[PDB]
Scaffold this active site. Sequence first.
Site, PDB file in Angstrom:
ATOM      1  CG  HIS A 134     -12.522  -3.425  10.239  1.00 10.50           C
ATOM      2  ND1 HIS A 134     -13.211  -4.002   9.189  1.00 10.50           N
ATOM      3  CD2 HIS A 134     -11.205  -3.537   9.936  1.00 10.50           C
ATOM      4  CE1 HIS A 134     -12.348  -4.465   8.302  1.00 10.50           C
ATOM      5  NE2 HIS A 134     -11.126  -4.201   8.734  1.00 10.50           N
TER       6      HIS A 134
ATOM      7  CG  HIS B 283      -1.825  -1.099   1.287  1.00  7.74           C
ATOM      8  ND1 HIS B 283      -3.180  -0.897   1.093  1.00  7.74           N
ATOM      9  CD2 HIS B 283      -1.655  -2.422   1.505  1.00  7.74           C
ATOM     10  CE1 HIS B 283      -3.798  -2.065   1.152  1.00  7.74           C
ATOM     11  NE2 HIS B 283      -2.892  -3.000   1.425  1.00  7.74           N
TER      12      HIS B 283
ATOM     13  CE  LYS C  65      -6.183  -6.509  -2.944  1.00 13.40           C
ATOM     14  NZ  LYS C  65      -5.526  -5.559  -2.073  1.00 13.40           N
TER      15      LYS C  65
ATOM     16  CG  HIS D  76      -4.566 -11.096   2.811  1.00 16.21           C
ATOM     17  ND1 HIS D  76      -5.840 -11.442   2.413  1.00 16.21           N
ATOM     18  CD2 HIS D  76      -4.423  -9.770   2.545  1.00 16.21           C
ATOM     19  CE1 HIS D  76      -6.452 -10.355   1.957  1.00 16.21           C
ATOM     20  NE2 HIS D  76      -5.586  -9.349   1.973  1.00 16.21           N
TER      21      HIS D  76
HETATM   22 NI    NI Z   1      -6.279  -7.349   1.732  1.00 16.95          NI
HETATM   23 NI    NI Z   2      -3.613  -5.032   1.594  1.00 12.27          NI
HETATM   24  O   LIG Z   3      -4.722  -6.510   2.514  1.00 14.98           O
END
Ligand code: NI
Ligand code: NI
Ligand SMILES: [O-]
Lengths: 122, 100, 100, 100, 570, 570
Positions: free
Chosen positions: F323, F139, F220, F275
């Site tokens: 979150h 990121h 993505k 992941h």
């Molecule tokens: Ni992710």
């Molecule tokens: Ni990510």
């Molecule tokens: O992620």
Amino acid sequence: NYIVPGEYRVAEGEIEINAGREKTTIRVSNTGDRPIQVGSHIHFVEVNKELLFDRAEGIGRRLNIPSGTAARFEPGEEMEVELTELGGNREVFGISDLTNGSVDNKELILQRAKELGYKGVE
Amino acid sequence: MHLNPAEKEKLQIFLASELALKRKARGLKLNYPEAVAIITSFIMEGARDGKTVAMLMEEGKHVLTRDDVMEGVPEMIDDIQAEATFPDGTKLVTVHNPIS
Amino acid sequence: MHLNPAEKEKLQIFLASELALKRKARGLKLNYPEAVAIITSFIMEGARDGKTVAMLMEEGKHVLTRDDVMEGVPEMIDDIQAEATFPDGTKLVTVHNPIS
Amino acid sequence: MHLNPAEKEKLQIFLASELALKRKARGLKLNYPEAVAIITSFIMEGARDGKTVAMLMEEGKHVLTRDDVMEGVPEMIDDIQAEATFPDGTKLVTVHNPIS
Amino acid sequence: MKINRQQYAESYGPTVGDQVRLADTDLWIEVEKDYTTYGDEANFGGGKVLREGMGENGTYTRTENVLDLLLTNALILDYTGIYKADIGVKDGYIVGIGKGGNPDIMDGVTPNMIVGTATEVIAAEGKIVTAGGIDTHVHFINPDQVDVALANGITTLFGGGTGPAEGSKATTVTPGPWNIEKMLKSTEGLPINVGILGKGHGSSIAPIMEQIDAGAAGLKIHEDWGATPASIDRSLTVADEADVQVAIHSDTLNEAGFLEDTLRAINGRVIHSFHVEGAGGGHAPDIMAMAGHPNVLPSSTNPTRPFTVNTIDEHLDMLMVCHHLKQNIPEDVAFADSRIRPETIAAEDILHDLGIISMMSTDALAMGRAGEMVLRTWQTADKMKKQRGPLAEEKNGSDNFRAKRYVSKYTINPAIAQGIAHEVGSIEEGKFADLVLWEPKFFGVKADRVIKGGIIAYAQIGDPSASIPTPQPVMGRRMYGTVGDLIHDTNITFMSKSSIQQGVPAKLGLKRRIGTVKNCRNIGKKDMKWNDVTTDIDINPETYEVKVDGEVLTCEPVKELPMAQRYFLF
Amino acid sequence: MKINRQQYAESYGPTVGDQVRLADTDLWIEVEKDYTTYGDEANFGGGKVLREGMGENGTYTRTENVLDLLLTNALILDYTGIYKADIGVKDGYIVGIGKGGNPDIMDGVTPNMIVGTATEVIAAEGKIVTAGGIDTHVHFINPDQVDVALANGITTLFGGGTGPAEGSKATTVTPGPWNIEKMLKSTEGLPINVGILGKGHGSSIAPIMEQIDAGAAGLKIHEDWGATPASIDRSLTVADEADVQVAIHSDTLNEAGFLEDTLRAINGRVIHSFHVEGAGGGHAPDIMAMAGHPNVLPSSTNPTRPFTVNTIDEHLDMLMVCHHLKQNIPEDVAFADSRIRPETIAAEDILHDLGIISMMSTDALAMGRAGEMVLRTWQTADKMKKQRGPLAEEKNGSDNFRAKRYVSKYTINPAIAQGIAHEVGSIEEGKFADLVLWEPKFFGVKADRVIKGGIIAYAQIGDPSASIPTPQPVMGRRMYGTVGDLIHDTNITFMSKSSIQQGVPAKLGLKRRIGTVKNCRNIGKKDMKWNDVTTDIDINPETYEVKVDGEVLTCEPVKELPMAQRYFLF
Ligand code: NI
Ligand code: NI
Ligand SMILES: [O-]
Ligand SMILES: O=S(=O)(O)c1cc(O)ccc1O
Ligand SMILES: O=S(=O)(O)c1cc(O)ccc1O
Ligand SMILES: O=S(=O)(O)c1cc(O)ccc1O
Ligand SMILES: O=S(=O)(O)c1cc(O)ccc1O
Ligand code: NI
Ligand code: NI
Ligand SMILES: [O-]
């Protein structure tokens, strides 16, 4: 008089969401063995195939819940939810590819739903 | 020493915490950055001591109390987060509402 | 902590002052940068304590005397200037001829 | 203060050494960067005290012993080098195998 | 479904009628209106609204009414209002203020604010969003000054200098064609908008004009170069031909004239009067009288803002040491005493509150603080509320009127003064997306995120080695908008029309966006938003007492300010 | 003359059969072969071999088989082997692995590895040399992240973002043509190789494809933008046409489908599953089952690596706070509990060891650590050796097989996945000279020297004011490869074929080396070096127990790791 920096002092009253739109309550059951959580703005007929409900009643609708919140169905859980009407042009594209156009095309939506095994096409 | 970028930055937090602790020792009510520095350094020293993430989540709520800080500072600090090298590698500690 | 550029820089002055104070505590006559650091940090800590600009202008002349510093250092330092956050905001302190 | 680039960097070493000395004072066995910082700062403070390069080459071997540091740290440190301003200008000190 | 207001404001930011405290001040702003449709608020994240087929449109290409960036749920604080809206950005400009999302399914979507595949999202719920500050009194002395300005929400620096040369240390001047060229080239590396002032001094037109043709954005007349009747006259003749602004720091010494002589030289032409109160410079003791005239665009610099118990001690000494003035020379003492006056500093707080001084600025590194223009504007507003009460024009118990009066002093008014408000200075459709997000607890103190040309340039953010961006140390840092070639597209170099027509940017290889200075010569005091008051200001030559409409303007200094020791580490 | 082996290894580095400990782990690597001629080893210094007429040839011009750089006596650790060689570089590329020197007088010189007047020397005796790490889950949130990555031996960042905007904070996405352009321009200033991912979301092809044509290197798909059947399908249709890779972070919530629905949407097409264990995201609780499929290129992100006693506490809380999840809301608790699972994290350690998860990555600043991909790969290998023993395939008591399996996870496999292994990802002739030198005591912890395009970009080096480079403070610092225009030649911007054919680099003024993404659509799991296992992974919906070949995969967390408190100051 204690100062909390940047604090709010909200006005009186409550905020009514989705005001003036038709509401509909329906029962929905998660027939799968994994949890399903559904967001406020997904076209309700296009949710996970393993949620069983009257799919017709989700056409042109979404959950009547605050914007950005979600309803959760644990495996095997059945509960009632309240739906409100989609607005704007009342068109949906994409998501599960059930609609791709006007939400008024109910027979076409249900036909595709049935053919792909979305539960509860009646 | 082979310092990496994070090691160099984090030295700053220790330093600010030393500064803040001297201010507190001479009787000052601490401000926002002072309070954050003290609690942050306490977490990273805690990790260095070999404490667990759960122990530091608990302890970090008792490092400073409201009478140690200026009006409003407790309500300005919703949480403090720090990463440090525990015996089992880098972990994140988050201390919610550290000063009640 | 939300440090701004000046806050980060000024941490350096505190650090140099700590270093210098340790040198003085073990009996060294202080040099030019040592002396400046000690007096500067004293001013900024003073502001933090809530003293006035006029009090710090007076006190800053009595932090170090000639026997605390090396030959020539008093005459090298014509004044020391520092800005810090007083209770009423940032102000400039100038201490003229701090070491007589 | 008129700090030059090396003066600014080397403040970092003092700071890391302070941090490391606090860790040692609370009973921790020191790690690689901690040990290097302590010995390095000791050399530069030594120069400031007016010791000779030969005195610091000797003393630097007795600042920390193996029981002060973690397993393997003595064998990781083959030597420690530092430059500082002696009474007769900048000189290099190299301490070979500082921790036996 | 209904949601109570406390929970609504926690989730989406405040809505109509709700109030928000500005930092730790006593000032409250109230949401005047909201562009949302309740229930169709935009938000981004896991299971949130801005997802494909939902609040994000999956049909439209970028050209087709889709945004490059949507700031969701912003509380805008601007001369144009204090209100809740989504802010849409495209090609580096603000293109829509309203309601963003997907017209497929949402009611009330502003037609050019579609969230599409091309759209980035910044969550502004619970933030206050303002225009980037416009500082029109910058000495370019130390490049480290730029981050200082960005950290307090300043996005445009107008001024002059070549670094720490004595001319630049005293005056906002980049003198002559060659120094101007050199500094336009330096600007390529500065992550902020810039405009350069030439030396407004000479007795022939050509030496002055050639600076404008070289790429200066304006001129600065300063007493240290001779603020004489001739230099004033020639500078304004050039400005009137070139369509750029002239700033003045007048003859403190009264050597060639008194204030009335400077006004006669000006002869009704438009001029920006710097540090009009006069501690920062100008005809002793009455320069502040400039701020009553219709052709004067008056600004304050920041160390007198607001009047505090340490102000006079700090200034007397600063003046004495900077000018090599001696405490035992009576002419030096008389000069300092004629220049640093509690009577005009106190009146300056009130003149701001009344809309008689229109602008703030810094005087960065000459006699002012690069990172404190915004900070001190609000400290002044807060002191005035405490001492004078809510202004008569307020209602609902909010401080909206005062908040609009004050935000205008460092946003839109300097931009109008300088001829650059077509590009910058306010959150309006069609202007450059220079936007500052503030947590209300830090409002006016430390900016959260500073957006330049639609990309974040500066942010308060944490450990770059962490799993997430919030762990300590949280500090101000340059972001991707400052890196590589992106620095060119995110920032504007403001230049004279003639230098642009003559191809100076291509001649120097400037890659930055080039902004045109214009419409600076036919404005006046009446064009300063919320700060348009003309009046007869009288300053008593013997006592320095200030009167407006025959009433003496007196005020007390304060011992403490908000936005001060609660926040700063030093 | 004979030399005993201890002295030989001290002088020249280790030779055939000798073993070397990796940092403070239990892992030993053994030299498999050596390209030298004993007695003719290359070395540089006073009275050493690489001198004119001796080991340096004084006849040949640079074009004539002479090197720009020779790394002498390197212990290479690579998917292709663990062995001793000299490494020759020319025009920024690896041109020879073998034996360097002067064929005038030395036996066994590789014909294009002549040391000549044009040749620089890096001594790699006693160092381990690996390819630069390839992190495919970045990121772009804070530019300070780059040095963090370089300090742990990462040389290529693939991912997305525009800085600390919420979309970028959640997802590796640079959305749309304009944000892509802006970030390609920013990249000009980043001293690392880069490839940018667009938003893999939409229900029409055009909005997605236009990002590829704008210069994106891949796409993505992320649940936060709607990881729906349509977005998945359209992204893969685009990818198949454009020859770029698609990464996926699937619908954790199961809102539009369960894992089998996502797999049906994929429809056998190639995809990189990020992941894959699922703590970082994806269909709860069974997403890790993706790693058994032949069309899935599966990666882990790093905070779950390896399973430790603080892992679960750290993650539960990280998830909850990021979150805005509340401890007293049962839906929030049920969601966290369905997502953070000791059963899948433990199995993830073993799936790595078995060659079933092929790749590591960071998830830098979203839920992963920019400077810990390499570090954690080795900590995992070490934990597995301790818990499972040497793998069956080992011999001589070395850990070579495991070392090759693991080094592949962050070098060659991500490069193959992304379509860039023709340029980067391994120490092979014809690839870009991105090389990382490690002291074995610091192996995988802190890189000694990072070479980019044949020039050092980053190094652990000392006081710049000293007589020599080793005095304190020794810290990570940017070297000359990062300075001025050299940053352009030492780094690669990876772009789609179509953006390259359309002239995007010239349109944007990009000066960096341009790399082409290709051969991403007809690979699968079988193409992952040493990590090519396909199998039926079963995840029990009630207990989260993981099975492979009907055996439950269970593992214990550890209280301590190597490559941790011995090394780091914080
Ligand atoms: Ni992710
Ligand atoms: Ni990510
Ligand atoms: O992620
Ligand atoms: O020129 S200086 O940088 O020495 C300076 C000193 C001073 O006391 C006030 C202003 C100044 O510009
Ligand atoms: O309103 S007052 O006349 O009492 C006043 C007090 C003050 O301290 C500064 C300004 C003022 O207008
Ligand atoms: O957006 S934030 O930078 O505040 C953030 C906070 C957090 O607790 C986890 C992830 C995040 O990206
Ligand atoms: O080999 S074991 O089955 O004992 C084992 C233990 C362990 O703690 C993690 C993984 C494992 O395969
Ligand atoms: Ni002035
Ligand atoms: Ni000035
Ligand atoms: O000024």
